[PDB]
Structures are given as structure tokens and as C-alpha cells.
Swiss-Prot record, chain B:
Component of the Arp2/3 complex, a multiprotein complex that mediates actin polymerization upon stimulation by nucleation-promoting factor (NPF). The Arp2/3 complex mediates the formation of branched actin networks in the cytoplasm, providing the force for cell motility. In addition to its role in the cytoplasmic cytoskeleton, the Arp2/3 complex also promotes actin polymerization in the nucleus, thereby regulating gene transcription and repair of damaged DNA. Polyubiquitinated by RNF128 with 'Lys-63'-linked chains, leading to proteasomal degradation. One of its GO terms (cellular component) is site of double-strand break. It comes from the Eukaryota. It is found in: Cytoplasm, Cytoskeleton; Cell projection; Nucleus. It comes from Bos taurus. Component of the Arp2/3 complex composed of ACTR2/ARP2, ACTR3/ARP3, ARPC1B/p41-ARC, ARPC2/p34-ARC, ARPC3/p21-ARC, ARPC4/p20-ARC and ARPC5/p16-ARC. The keyword NAD does not apply. This is Actin-related protein 2/3 complex subunit 5. The chain holds residues 36 to 151 of 151 of the full protein. Belongs to the ARPC5 family.
From Swiss-Prot, chain C:
Component of the Arp2/3 complex composed of ACTR2/ARP2, ACTR3/ARP3, ARPC1B/p41-ARC, ARPC2/p34-ARC, ARPC3/p21-ARC, ARPC4/p20-ARC and ARPC5/p16-ARC. This is Actin-related protein 2/3 complex subunit 4. The keyword Nucleus applies. Coiled coil: none annotated. Transmembrane segments: none annotated. Belongs to the ARPC4 family. GO terms for biological process: actin filament polymerization; Arp2/3 complex-mediated actin nucleation. Its main location: cytoplasm. InterPro entries: ARPC2/4 (IPR034666), ARPC4 (IPR008384). It comes from Bos taurus (Bovine). Keywords: Acetylation, Actin-binding, Cell projection, Cytoplasm, Cytoskeleton, Nucleus.
UniProtKB/Swiss-Prot annotation, chain D:
This is NCK-interacting protein with SH3 domain. The chain holds residues 376 to 714 of 722 of the full protein. It is found in: Nucleus. Has an important role in stress fiber formation induced by active diaphanous protein homolog 1 (DRF1). Induces microspike formation, in vivo. In vitro, stimulates N-WASP-induced ARP2/3 complex activation in the absence of CDC42. May play an important role in the maintenance of sarcomeres and/or in the assembly of myofibrils into sarcomeres. Implicated in regulation of actin polymerization and cell adhesion. Plays a role in angiogenesis. Highest expression in heart, brain, skeletal muscle, kidney and liver. Lower levels in placenta, lung, small intestine and leukocytes. Weak expression in colon, thymus and spleen. Associates with the intermediate filaments, vimentin and desmin. Binds the first and third SH3 domains of NCK. Binds the proline-rich domains of N-WASP through its SH3 domain. Similarly, binds diaphanous protein homolog 1 (DRF1). Binds the SH3 domains of GRB2 through its proline-rich domains. Interacts with Helicobacter pylori toxin vacA. Isoform 4 interacts with FHOD1. Interacts with FASLG. Interacts with TMIGD2. It is linked to A chromosomal aberration involving NCKIPSD/AF3p21 is found in therapy-related leukemia. Translocation t(3;11)(p21;q23) with KMT2A/MLL1.
From Swiss-Prot, chain E:
This is Actin-related protein 2/3 complex subunit 2. Gene3D superfamilies: 3.30.1460.20. Keywords: Acetylation, Actin-binding, Cell projection, Cytoplasm, Cytoskeleton, Nucleus, Synapse, Synaptosome. GO terms for cellular component: Arp2/3 protein complex; cytosol; endosome; focal adhesion; glutamatergic synapse; lamellipodium; muscle cell projection membrane; neuron projection. It is found in: Cytoplasm, Cytoskeleton; Cell projection; Synapse, Synaptosome; Nucleus. Coiled coil: none annotated. It comes from Bos taurus. Belongs to the ARPC2 family. GO terms for biological process: actin filament polymerization; Arp2/3 complex-mediated actin nucleation; positive regulation of actin filament polymerization; positive regulation of lamellipodium assembly; positive regulation of substrate adhesion-dependent cell spreading. Component of the Arp2/3 complex composed of ACTR2/ARP2, ACTR3/ARP3, ARPC1B/p41-ARC, ARPC2/p34-ARC, ARPC3/p21-ARC, ARPC4/p20-ARC and ARPC5/p16-ARC. Interacts with SHANK3; the interaction probably mediates the association of SHANK3 with the Arp2/3 complex. Interacts with DNAI3; this interaction reduces binding of the Arp2/3 complex to the VCA domain of nucleation promoting factors.
Length: 339, 116, 165, 329, 279
């Protein structure tokens, strides 16, 4: 319930630090800004003007303390802190054409773009340079949202091809082998392990669970679809009376929260018993708007707690407001909400 | 396409609920023939047109979500051919459908790749 | 025929197709344009929907992931009203530079055309935009009527004054 | 607390006439004090103070306004009367029951050399008669067919000014005919039957009709009165002699406006039944079946209106009205 | 000015200036100017033979011959007389003024000379009026404009002008004004009768090489003895000669007012759109 008015224009990407001490964001500009928190008021500390266009994706490796960013500049920048100045390194994306996220291994990052090729990229210490191998198998459209599993070897991504596929970007030269998952045994770089059955709506949202058992995604057909490999890769969809969702993340192992064009963060729970998804309701209950943000949500990351028991949810939207939510206050407010 | 007789029987019976519920069965969305889609659209249009104003709420409330989406899409297809003052009834039906399925129905109608 | 539920379904459809977002061109290097206008990618174009309250006055909405093009053909009661409508629509079209939510030419087979871009959808309230469309229709009707009455009054006055001399 | 004391003291000093034999400057200061008090302070206090002792201060202000000969003081009193009318409905009924209306009329007829004063008088009279709750027969002796012909001449010919009084006179006309009686006992209709050479009033009423807004409804009180334009149009189109004001083309234009307003009106509203009744009257007294125009779309619209089986009572009343008015041939 | 001015302001002001400068006994200054008037009239005033003592005013019309055919010389001699002189080279009618010999009253001469075109066109009207007064029935077509022709013809007098409306909208506005002028007998009962013809001329002007079209118009002005009298000759003539010009000017005025209303409505709507933004 803590919205902070930072800018008037929309927001592109929302990133956080290791100890969540600093927050990084871009305001649809050729530069990216990094602000910290000193008291009740927030103040900007760093500014990076390396990119040559509107910044689309940005993710910060917590343990590595190193933030990579890639947008319309058709290039990637693996920025690392050098003394009192964040030095950027141009990691060649090798794409003729909107998403980026570090792995749990924090050693290689996936850059999903409009080149219809999930461009995985690892850092070669032998040549002191970043290399980006491109996984393009069974990919027909851009990669809207990309999220890893706990394995740090299998990536998930939604496409404009009306489907959310879970492929493998595992480079066997940057890590050890991958253990057998319930999503399959054969895990190879480029091998399609999973896919969606939808033929309508764009998969703007996609996120995997903490246990790595279930992978959920949000489609732009006013429908959300969560799949569980625990029940032979069963797919469970649900149509929301509200508008389409833009970002999707799981709070618990059976409770996920998501927002979008509805401009209001919503909560939902899926019963493993019956094998179907259910709607929890509106967690954001109160210009002329009936919600905090005056536009659609654009991103929703986790502040602290994990995907099994999030204690604080961070929400960035097209309203220019930083929405800081707490599960405790939300549960203390809506007594009819079962998590 | 759908079956004409199954609807004609309920139409002769006066039970509009059965006819409306049967008209949306096996919609020709996957079909490539525009004739089948035109037939289904005209059929649904005929079904909705004969309906009385005050009784529409019950029949509209009797339908399901998927049926609401199919009805919205079929109504959109029927909206491209406004004739015999069917536009007013289609408008009232659009209001009822909007109140029933919300913005999600029309959103599903626009995001659809294969429809009537 | 004419009702308020028509502009309510129009408002709802306008609210549904105001879910656009910024998207780069997949064909051109570092290019960014409206998807609904050029219609280059069939994967990004949604099924266009038309709404008609009558055989003469209607509104056609064609949405996209990065654009929403709304064409509106207003009612034509008489010839004078038609010429006036054409003149006003043209006069509004000339100032398309000011109205960044309208386009310089009307859609073929329609009276006027407004292209609500993703960039325009990102720098203006969607709710206020829908309100702008609805107000655009009701104001179109009312203003047209008022203009008609004023013109007729002027003609009557001029005729009377010339006849009195 | 201070405002009530200042208002009571002003009312007491003005009721002493001692105020009429006092300096114009002091009286101007007192009137300005009372006006500013009624305009900037709480409404409840002003309402209680004005209606105090059965509108004693109000009646006293009225009598003092009737005895005073100063133009500026009359303007200030008219403004204060406007505020008092904007305060509540009880003060409006009290002022309407007073002779303030008649005196305002007589002053409006006598002093034609004061534009602003005439305007404020027209506005105050329009606000006082905007309710149309009570109708004293004595007030008809000062404001009737003569004053009606005068205002009609003011609308048709106009005076030798900003000309913002023509629309104000039209507003006062619409307000006065709001509390009128049927075509047989209507003074306005009688004056309209007397001189039907007025084409301008028709055009102005037409613009007022196409606008859709009501120029009489300024305040928002409970039990709001009916629509002025509809009732006036009904009283005008209540008889051929009074409907004769409309010209050959103007009649067709008005038919177009009434039909369009009837068709655009959704089921459930209140104005639709009224516009339908007006359309019925326009085809009753006026020659509708003469040039047989605009009747086709009207027929289609009527057919779509009668097939409207709405559970609501408003649409049922409207359907009953159109069924009453279904003289089809 | 609602009604079109009949007198030419240029010639009147110039002549007034010259006369005022001359009455003071000041030095005679040369004058040279080319002016124009409605329906394509071409005026040109200059000093003859370089003589500052003489001022010549020339006027040229395309239908000068058709006007002279109806006795224009007699009317010009009656109006100007001594002022009328040999026409300038290329001009139709030229008047002369000597600075060395002038009268006291200047207003009459200026007001008369300023109505040059009116007096030039009044010939046929006067002839027809006298003809109607005499009662000699059973007795004209003047091409005042390039694509227009005015046709003039027991108890009444008919004057049907066949003009052209170039713009498509101007035809509509003109049709509205004519539709209002036809039933204009509601305002003043003593006024003349007004008829209008959309695409084809009246029965009188039939198969007389009548130019018919969607862009043409034949307006019939039916005057009576009350307006055709010698007492109200000048005024009625002043109006009738300027009927077309007044019509076009009025329609154009309507176009302008429409432009204003459009600008205002655009301002209101643009205000709504500006009110739809965040800040």
C-alpha cells in the first residue's frame, strides 16, 4: 500500500539490489537511473547513459552485484561497479532485431528478443568476453517475459506466438550437468521441454515456481494459465472478467498474484486437489481511478520472502508509481482472502 | 454448423432458453467455409431477434462463460450486418452480455484468432 | 434504433482495445511504428470489430498490440448536414498535427478516422481517452445540430433583410 | 455569529422609512454588507435570518425596495434578492408571494434607460418565477397580456447595449409560462395569438431546444419543476392560432429536432415521454400530414418504441402516451 | 455593412482628396491609379497629356456595347453632361475634370461619380420602367459576368438573373438563402415576389440559348409598380444591380462564420483532450 510518485511517464523495467538496498529503473529513455533509499525520501545516486535507445530489459545479479541491461539499442550491457562509477561492458547480442533476466546461477543471462531467438549469453573468461549463443528452435515470435526455474538450467518464456514454452539454455561450458527434473529427463541446449496449447492471446507474462514443479503464465486473452508437471504436465487455464494481465508472479506454492491492464493487483489460488485455478479477488481495494496506479502494471518482482512465501511484493506500472505491497497488510485488510 | 430442427422445435414450443442454448453448439470456428460461418451467424441472429425484451435476462444469465464469449463473437459477426431493426435487440443483448462476462468477454472476442 | 447503450458498447470496446503497448518493428532495424496502420505482421493484428446502431451511422474499431485505429461514420440526415460534416471533419483533419490521437485522412468508407497510438496510449489516460471518444460523438451530434440551426437562422435573417429593402 | 448580527442590524436599520431619508453612501455600504454577508457566509444562518419572524427581514427588504427611488440601491437589492432566492425554496416562495414581482414588472416597463438594472430585474424575476408553485391572481394585473406583448416585442424587435437582455427576457418568458395554465387560460398563448408576426422567438426557442440545456434551472432544489421548453412548446403548439408562429421551413426544422430528440432518447428517461407528447401536439395542431415529411423515420421509431417491452414504469408510461397518440392513417 | 456599398470608395476618396487640395489653392499634383469593381469592372484614373490641370477617369466593362445599345449615351449625357468627354483609348466611358473650373458643392459630384457603374447599368432598368409605365407590352440579355447572364423582361416586371456558383458548398448555401428569400413574403407583405430556379431557367427564358447545369442558377425577381416607380427608382436599382454581389458576399460571410464556429468547437474539443492528459 506504499505508492511512491517518481515520474509522470510510464516505467519500463524494475530491478532491485542484493540486500534490496538500492533500486534501479528506466523511464522510457536512452539512459537508466539508479536510486537509493535514505530515510522516508528517495534520492537518485547513479546514472548510466550507455544504451542508444529506449531500455527494455534490466536485471541485477544479487550475489554478483552486477546489473545487465538490453533494449532497443540492439545491444547488451553487463554493467559492473568500478569504484565510484558503474562501468558497462558491451556484450554482443548478435541479433538482427525486449527481455533479459539473470539465472539463479548468476553466471549466464537469457536475452529474449524480437529476433525470434532466446539469446542465452555466458561470460568467457578465456577470451575475457561475453558470448551469446541463440536458441531459436520452435520459436516463432518475440520473447515477452522470461523467467528461470530453480535449476538455473531451464528457462521459460512467453511468445507473441500465443504460447509459453519452457526450453533449455544450458551451456555445458559454464556449469555442471543438470539433475533430472519432473519436466523431463533429456535436457539439451535448444531442446524444447514444454509448450502451451493456447491458440489465442499473447503470453505477456511467464514465471516458474520456487519448487520448479509448476510454471505459470499470463496471456493477453484475459486469461491466465498455470501448468503443473506434477500431474503429467497438466495445463489449467482461467478466464478473468477483468482485462488482460501484463505481469505474473507466484507468492506461494499454490497462491499467485498478478496485475495488468486491469490496473489493479489481483490475487489467486490454485487447488492441487480438483486440478483447477481459482480467483482470490482484488488485493488492491480503496484522477478518478479506483486503484493506486493510474495505468496498467508493467512488472512485478519480489522484495523478500521467495516465491513460496513472499513477505513483500514490488510492483512497477505504466502509472509512474512505485507500488510497495506487503502480504501481511494485505491479509490484514482483506479477511476474505485465503492465501 | 448447427442443427436447425433442434432449435425449430424449441421455437415452436415457446421455450426460448432451449433454442438459445442449442444454437451455440458446435460453432463453425475451425471451419474454413465462410458459408457455414454465415449460416451460424444468421441462425444466432434469428434466435436473438425473436426474443422478448423483459425475458432476455434469464436466458442470458443461463449461459456459461465460454458460451458468453461465443455469443459475443457471434454478435460481433452479426453486428457487421445491421438490418430489419435487429441492431436495437443486438444492442440490448450486447449490454446484457457486457454486464454478464465483463470486459473479458469482448477482450476474448478481439484476441481470438479463429472465430465466426 | 438510437440509444445510449450503443455508446456504452462503443465505450466498452474502446476500453478493451485501449490495452496497447510500445513495440519495435520486427522487419526494420531500429524502427518503431503503429501496427494497426501499416498492418505488416498478421500475428499482431487482432480481429477488427464493427458496431452499427443503424444503416447510416456506425463505428469501426481495428485494434493492434501497438496501435488502435477507430473510424467513425456519423449520421447523415440531409445534404446540408453532410456538407457541414465533411467540412468539419476536414477542418479537424487539417489540425491532425495538434490532435496526436487523430489522423489526417478519414478511413475509406467512413466519415472520420482517429489513430490512437501506443505512444499516445502511454502518455494519456485510457479512461480519459474513452471519455474523449464518447464526448466526441455526443458533441459531434449536438454541435452539428446547433450549426444547422444557426446557419438556417442566418439565411432567414439575410433573406428578410434583403426583402425588406 | 457576527454575520447574523450584521444582517439583523442591517435589516433593523433598513426597516426603521428612515433608510429612504438617509445618505446614499451609507445605504450603499449597508446593502453591500448585507449582500456580501448573504454571498460569503453560511447558508443556514442567512436562511434563518431572512425567514426570521416569517420572512420579516425579507418582506421589509421588499417594501424598502418598493419605496426606494435609487437605481443602484435597486440593483443591489435585486442582487441580494437573487442570493436569497439561491439560498432556499422557502425564501423563493415567500418572495414570489410578495409584490416584488409586480414592482419589478412596473419598474421594467417604466425605466427603459437603465440596461443593467433591467437585466438584473429580469434575472431576479426569472429566478423568483423559476419555481411556479403559487400563482396570485393579483400579480396578473401587473404582468399579463400587455407585458407579454412587451417582452415578445423585446425579443422580436429588440432595444437600441450588449443585447444580453434578449436571452434573459426569453428566459423570463420561459419561466413565466412554466406556471401558466392551459391554452384556453394562458396569457402568453393569447399574446402569441395576437401578434404571430414573431419569427425570431421561434428561432431562439429552436436554438434553446437543440441545445438540450434548460435556461430556467439554475438552482438545485428538491421537487424540481418540469421542463420549460417542452411545456412552452406544448402551450404554443396547443392550438393552430398559437402554432401559427412557426414558418413553412421552421415547422419542418422543429419537426426534425423533435423527431431526432425523440429517437436519440433512450428508454427509461423522462424527457422522452414529454418530447413524444410534443410530437403528438405538433401533429395535432400544426399541419403535419400536409407535406407528409419526416413521418417515415418517425413511424419506424414509433414502431421500435412500441415493441419496447421494458419492465420499468417510465417506458410503460411513454408507451401508453404513444399509444394514446397513435392516430394512424 | 450588411448591404453592399454602391459607391466606389477609391474614386470617392481620391476625388475628395484632389478637390480638398485644389480648394486650398495648393499646387496641382498628378494622380494615377488602377482600380476595379464587382462583376469585373475595370477603372483607371490618370492625368491626360501630362497636364496636371486635367484629371481623366476611365471605366471599362466587357458588356459596354450591350449597355450602349439600350441608350447609355443619353443617360450618361443626362448625368454627367459637361463632365462627359471623349472616351480614353481602350476605355468604355471616360469623364474629364478641369481643376481650373469647378463648382462650390463637391458632395453631389462625388456621390454621383462614385455611382458610375450603377448609373451605367441603370439605363436598361430605367427603359424597362418607362416601358412598363407607358403600358407598351410585347417588347433584354446582358452578360455582366463571364459565365453569367442577366435577363430582364403587363401588371408586373420580371428580372431573372442567371448566375453561376463555382464552389459545391456555395451552391448549397445559395440554395438555402434562395429558399429563405422565396418565402420572404412573410416578413414584408409590400416586398417584391421572389422565385428561384435550380438547374433550369424559367418558362420565359426557355430555349433562348439558356445555359443549364448543376452549377448554374436562375433567380427571378418579380417587382411591381410600387417598386418600379420613378420615386423609388434609385434605391431599387441600387439593390437590384448589387443582388448577385450581395448574394455571393453573404454566402461567403456564412462560410466565414462557419469557420469561426469550427475554430471554437475545435477549441472546446481540444480543451477536452488537453483535460484528458496527466498534467
Amino acid at each position: 500500500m506504499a505508492y511512491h510518485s517518481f515520474l509522470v511517464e510510464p516505467i519500463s523495467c524494475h530491478a532491485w539490489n542484493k540486500d534490496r538496498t538500492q533500486i534501479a529503473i528506466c523511464p522510457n529513455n536512452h539512459e537508466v537511473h539508479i536510486y537509493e533509499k535514505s530515510g522516508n525520501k528517495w534520492v537518485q545516486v547513479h546514472e548510466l547513459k550507455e544504451h542508444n535507445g529506449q531500455v527494455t530489459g534490466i536485471d541485477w545479479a544479487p550475489d554478483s552485484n552486477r546489473i545487465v541491461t538490453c533494449g532497443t539499442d540492439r545491444n547488451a550491457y553487463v554493467w559492473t561497479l568500478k569504484g565510484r562509477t558503474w562501468k558497462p561492458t558491451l556484450v554482443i547480442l548478435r541479433i538482427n532485431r525486449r527481455c533479459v533476466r539473470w539465472a539463479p546461477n548468476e553466471k549466464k543471462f537469457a536475452v529474449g528478443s524480437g529476433s525470434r531467438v532466446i539469446s542465452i549469453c555466458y561470460f568467457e573468461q578465456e577470451n575475457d568476453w561475453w558470448v551469446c549463443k541463440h536458441i531459436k528452435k520452435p520459436i516463432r515470435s518475440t520473447v515477452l517475459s522470461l523467467d528461470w526455474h530453480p535449476n538455473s538450467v531451464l528457462l521459460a518464456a512467453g511468445s507473441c506466438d500465443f504460447k509459453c514454452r519452457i526450453f533449455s539454455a544450458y551451456i555445458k561450458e559454464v556449469e555442471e550437468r543438470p539433475a533430472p527434473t519432473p519436466w523431463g529427463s533429456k535436457m539439451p541446449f535448444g531442446e524444447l521441454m514444454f509448450e502451451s496449447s493456447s491458440s489465442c492471446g499473447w503470453v505477456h507474462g511467464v514465471c516458474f515456481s520456487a519448487n520448479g514443479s509448476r510454471v505459470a503464465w499470463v496471456s493477453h486473452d484475459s486469461t491466465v494459465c498455470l501448468a503443473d508437471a506434477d500431474k503429467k504436465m497438466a495445463v489449467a487455464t482461467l478466464a478473468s472478467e477483468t482485462l488482460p494481465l501484463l505481469a505474473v508472479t507466484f507468492i506461494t506454492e499454490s497462491s499467485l498474484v498478478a496485475a495488468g491492464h486491469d490496473c489493479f493487483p489481483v490475487l489467486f489460488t490454485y487447488d492441487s486437489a480438483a486440478g483447477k485455478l481459482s480467483f482470490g479477488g482484488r488485493l488492491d481495494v480503496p484522477a478518478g481511478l479506483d486503484s493506486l496506479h493510474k495505468n496498467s502494471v508493467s512488472q512485478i518482482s519480489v522484495l523478500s520472502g521467495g516465491k513460496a512465501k513472499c513477505s513483500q511484493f514490488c510492483t512497477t506500472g505504466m502509472d509512474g508509481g512505485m507500488s510497495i505491497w506487503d502480504v501481511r497488510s494485505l491479509e490484514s485488510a482483506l479477511k476474505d482472502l485465503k492465501i | 454448423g448447427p442443427d436447425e430442427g433442434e432449435v425449430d422445435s424449441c421455437l415452436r414450443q415457446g421455450n426460448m432458453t432451449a433454442a438459445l442454448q442449442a444454437a451455440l453448439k458446435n460453432p463453425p470456428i475451425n471451419t474454413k467455409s465462410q458459408a457455414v460461418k454465415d449460416r451460424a451467424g444468421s441462425i444466432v441472429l434469428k434466435v436473438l431477434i425473436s426474443f422478448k425484451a423483459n425475458d432476455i435476462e434469464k436466458a442470458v444469465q443461463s449461459l456459461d462463460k465460454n458460451g458468453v464469449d461465443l455469443l459475443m463473437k457471434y454478435i460481433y459477426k452479426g453486428f457487421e450486418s445491421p438490418s430489419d431493426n435487429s441492431s436495437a435487440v443486438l444492442l440490448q443483448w450486447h449490454e446484457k452480455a457486457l454486464a454478464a462476462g465483463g470486459v473479458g468477454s469482448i477482450v476474448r472476442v478481439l484476441t481470438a484468432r479463429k472465430t465466426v | 434504433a438510437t440509444l445510449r447503450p450503443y455508446l456504452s458498447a462503443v465505450r466498452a470496446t474502446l476500453q478493451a482495445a485501449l490495452c496497447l503497448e510500445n513495440f519495435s518493428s520486427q522487419v526494420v532495424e531500429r524502427h518503431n511504428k503503429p501496427e494497426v496502420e501499416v498492418r505488416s505482421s498478421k500475428e499482431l493484428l487482432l480481429q477488427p470489430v464493427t458496431i452499427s446502431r443503424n444503416e447510416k451511422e456506425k463505428v469501426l474499431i481495428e485494434g493492434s498490440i501497438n496501435s488502435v485505429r477507430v473510424s467513425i461514420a456519423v449520421k447523415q440526415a440531409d445534404e446540408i448536414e453532410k456538407i457541414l460534416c465533411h467540412k468539419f471533419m476536414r477542418f479537424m483533419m487539417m489540425r491532425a498535427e495538434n490532435f496526436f490521437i487523430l489522423r489526417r485522412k478519414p478511413v475509406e468508407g467512413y466519415d472520420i478516422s482517429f489513430l490512437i497510438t501506443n505512444f499516445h496510449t502511454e502518455q494519456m489516460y485510457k479512461h480519459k481517452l474513452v471519455d474523449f471518444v464518447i464526448h466526441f460523438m455526443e458533441e459531434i451530434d449536438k454541435e452539428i445540430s446547433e450549426m444547422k440551426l444557426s446557419v438556417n437562422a442566418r439565411a432567414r435573417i439575410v433573406a428578410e433583410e434583403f426583402l425588406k429593402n | 455569529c457576527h454575520d447574523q448580527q450584521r444582517l439583523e442590524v442591517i435589516f433593523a436599520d433598513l426597516a426603521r422609512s428612515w433608510a429612504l431619508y438617509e445618505d446614499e453612501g451609507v445605504i450603499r455600504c449597508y446593502l453591500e454588507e448585507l449582500l456580501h454577508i448573504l454571498t460569503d457566509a453560511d447558508p443556514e444562518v442567512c436562511k434563518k435570518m431572512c425567514k426570521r419572524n416569517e420572512f420579516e427581514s425579507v418582506l421589509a427588504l421588499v417594501a424598502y425596495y418598493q419605496m426606494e427611488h435609487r437605481a443602484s440601491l435597486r440593483l443591489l437589492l435585486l442582487k441580494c434578492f437573487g442570493a436569497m432566492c439561491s439560498l432556499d425554496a422557502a425564501i423563493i416562495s415567500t418572495l414570489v408571494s410578495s409584490v416584488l414581482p409586480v414592482e419589478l414588472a412596473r419598474d421594467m416597463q417604466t425605466d427603459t434607460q437603465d440596461h443593467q438594472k433591467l437585466c438584473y430585474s429580469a434575472l431576479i424575476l426569472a429566478m423568483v418565477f423559476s419555481m411556479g408553485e403559487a400563482v396570485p391572481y393579483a400579480h396578473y394585473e401587473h404582468l399579463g397580456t400587455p407585458f407579454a406583448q412587451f417582452l415578445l416585442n423585446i425579443v422580436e424587435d429588440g432595444l437600441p447595449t450588449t443585447e444580453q437582455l434578449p436571452d434573459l427576457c426569453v428566459n423570463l418568458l420561459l419561466a413565466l409560462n412554466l406556471h401558466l395554465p392551459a391554452a384556453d387560460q394562458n396569457v402568453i398563448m393569447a399574446a402569441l395569438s395576437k401578434h404571430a408576426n414573431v419569427k425570431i422567438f421561434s428561432e431562439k426557442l429552436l436554438l434553446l431546444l437543440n441545445r438540450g440545456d434548460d435556461p430556467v434551472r439554475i438552482f438545485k432544489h428538491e421537487p424540481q419543476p418540469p421542463h420549460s421548453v417542452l411545456k412552452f412548446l406544448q402551450d404554443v403548439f396547443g392550438s393552430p392560432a398559437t402554432a401559427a408562429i412557426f414558418y413553412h421551413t421552421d415547422m419542418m426544422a422543429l419537426i426534425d429536432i423533435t423527431v431526432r430528440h425523440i429517437a436519440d432518447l433512450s428508454p427509461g428517461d423522462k424527457l422522452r415521454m414529454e418530447y413524444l407528447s410534443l410530437m403528438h401536439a405538433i401533429v395535432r395542431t400544426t399541419p403535419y400530414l400536409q407535406h407528409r415529411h419526416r413521418l417515415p423515420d418517425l413511424q419506424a421509431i414509433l414502431r421500435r418504441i412500441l415493441n419496447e417491452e421494458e419492465t420499468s414504469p417510465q417506458c410503460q408510461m411513454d408507451r401508453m402516451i404513444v399509444r394514446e397518440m397513435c392516430k394512424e392513417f | 455593412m450588411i448591404l453592399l456599398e454602391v459607391n466606389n470608395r477609391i474614386i470617392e476618396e481620391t476625388l475628395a482628396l484632389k478637390f480638398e487640395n485644389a480648394a486650398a489653392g495648393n499646387k496641382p499634383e498628378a494622380v494615377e491609379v488602377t482600380f476595379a469593381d464587382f462583376d469585373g469592372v475595370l477603372y483607371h484614373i490618370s492625368n491626360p497629356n501630362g497636364d496636371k490641370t486635367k484629371v481623366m477617369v476611365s471605366i471599362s466593362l466587357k458588356f459596354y456595347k450591350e449597355l450602349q445599345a439600350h441608350g447609355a449615351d443619353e443617360l450618361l449625357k443626362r448625368v454627367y453632361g459637361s463632365y462627359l468627354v471623349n472616351p480614353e483609348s481602350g476605355y468604355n466611358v471616360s469623364l474629364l475634370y478641369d481643376l481650373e473650373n469647378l463648382p462650390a458643392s463637391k458632395d453631389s459630384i462625388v456621390h454621383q461619380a462614385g455611382m458610375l457603374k450603377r448609373n451605367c447599368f441603370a439605363s436598361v432598368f430605367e427603359k424597362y420602367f418607362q416601358f412598363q409605365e407607358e403600358g407598351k407590352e410585347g417588347e433584354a440579355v446582358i452578360h455582366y459576368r463571364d459565365d453569367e447572364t442577366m435577363y430582364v423582361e403587363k401588371d408586373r416586371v420580371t428580372v431573372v438573373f442567371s448566375t453561376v456558383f463555382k464552389d459545391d458548398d456555395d451552391v448549397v448555401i445559395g440554395k438555402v438563402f434562395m429558399q429563405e428569400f422565396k418565402e420572404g413574403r412573410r416578413a414584408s407583405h409590400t416586398a417584391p415576389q421572389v422565385l428561384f430556379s435550380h438547374r433550369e431557367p424559367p418558362l420565359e427564358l426557355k430555349d433562348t440559348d439558356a445555359a443549364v447545369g448543376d452549377n448554374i442558377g436562375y433567380i427571378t425577381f418579380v417587382l411591381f409598380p410600387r417598386h418600379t416607380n420613378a420615386s423609388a427608382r434609385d434605391n431599387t436599382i441600387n439593390l437590384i444591380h448589387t443582388f448577385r454581389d450581395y448574394l455571393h458576399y453573404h454566402i461567403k460571410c456564412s462560410k466565414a462564420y462557419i469557420h469561426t464556429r469550427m475554430r471554437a468547437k475545435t477549441s472546446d474539443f481540444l480543451k477536452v483532450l488537453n483535460r484528458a492528459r496527466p498534467d
